[PDB]
Structures are given as C-alpha cells and as structure tokens.
Amino acid sequence: DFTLRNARMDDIDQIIKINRLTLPENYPYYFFVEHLKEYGLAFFVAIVDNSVVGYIMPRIEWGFSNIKQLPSLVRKGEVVSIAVLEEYRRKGIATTLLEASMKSMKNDYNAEEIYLHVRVSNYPAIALYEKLNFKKVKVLKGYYADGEDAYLMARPL
Template structure:
C-alpha cells in the first residue's frame, strides 16, 4: 500500500486488525508521553514533544488502533555533515524517538510509521537523508532499520545514560 502524507491513513495489521497513521495532535500529548515512558528507557519532558510538534508537525506521526494510541514517531530535520556523502553538508532527517506498545508490535506499525515519517521529512522539510541512534543491543530495531535500507554509519560510545553504546544508522531519501 502506498503511504499518503495528508490526513489519516488506514492499514490492515499483520493479524488482521485495522490501525490508522496520522499526524500528532496536541490532544495526543499525554498518550505519547505515556508510550515513551512505558517502552523506552530514554524519557523526554512534555515540552520536548511539543517543540517537535510545533517545528515539524508533518513528521510527527502517531498510530491508533481500536481507539487507543499504540505508537508514535517523533522527527526533526537538521543541517550538518552528511552520514551518506562524507565531507558534504546536508539536510538530515533525524528520527528522535519511536515507540510502539508491546501488544501492538510485530504488526507492521513501526515500519509504516517509519515510511511515512521519512517521506514527510523529505517532502515537507527537504531532508536528503535520514539518521537515528539505536542501542547496539536492540537487535529487533536494528533489523527493522536494515530492512528499511539503513546502514550503520558510526558508533557513539556510552551514548545512553546507562553507558550503553549507540549505533548511528543512516540512509538516503533519494529513492522515496
């Protein structure tokens, strides 16, 4: 199914249930903060989510299933040295945070949020490539990102508050 960038879009999950991807609204804030706190060790204050929504509203995606928010993807676009074309500056999409509740995992939700978020960063904010940080131990996430065309571009020692390293993973947006 082709990902649309305007308005809500309905999908059929791998288990047959239906879910909707759409842009974040301020009314979603408490649910998104709750998902962040429940599924990720790195938690952000409410103002951080609001700031990203205000700056990059088209690239802040949520997933809703059975009337419940089950996932989110928060992105921004930065200007700096490219991870793809070394030595050149680029507009880089940054996947700041993505989370899906445990009962909604392995249904295709994260994949479709990633696709919509990457396309939005390219179309609305002129990103040429996209990158993210991921724990070196997070095998399921690394596998998803590789499936979506990301490659390991570097490693940041002790990136996370518990001392774990992060991989920087990146990909071009030219083919989206």
C-alpha cells in the same frame, strides 16, 4: 487493524506514556510539543480504537552528511524516537510510521538523508531499520545514560 495520522497536541499525554513504558529515554513534555510544533508534518501516531498505540517523533536540521564526506552542510531528518506498544507489535506499525515520517522528511522538509541512534543490543529495532535501508555509520561509545554504546545509523533519501 490500526490507522495512521499526524500527531496532535491532544495525543501528547498518550505519547509520553508510551515513551515511558517502552523506553528509558524519557523526554519531558515541552520537548514533545516543540517537535510537534516544528516538525509536525513528519510526526505520526498509530491509532487503535480511539487510542494512540505508537508514535514516531522527527527532527529536521542542517548538518554534515553521514552518507558522503562533504565540507558543506546538507539537510537531514532524524528519527528522535519511535515506539509501538507491546500489544501491537509485529503488525507493521513501526514500519508504516517510519515510511510515513521519511516520506514527509523528504517531501515536506526537503531532507536528503535520514539518521538515528539505537542501542547496540536493540536487535529488533536494528533489524527494522536495516529492512528500511539504514546502515551502521559509527559506534558511539557509552552514548546512553546506563552506559550502553549506540550505532549511528543512516540512509539516503
């Protein structure tokens, strides 16, 4: 089993290494810190035996709704990045991280909906999102550096 807890500054090196091992979207150090610092309550890590084995990094912002079409702003949470190490996959880790984060986006940050981007061929990640009620909103052509399209995916809170 694993345990879950909020991310801490000391976790950031392990988080960065996890991000580089599993994703081609490699955010710099300061980036992780400022999100930890601004949105920490929805920033979670999964721990196995004194080691961080996964994380979810959140963002909270004002913006326009992906759910309804309104001319006024609404409070949105964004899953900026999430990853679990290969060894610890299929154990519910990503699931529990995302529910943890979404609950915090709802209750700590008063978001009314949440969104994310995923590569159109990241089938395991898409499947995980759809299990958690996310729906495709938009295709963003050539969104990723390597040229792949993204789905903008969203769900209400």
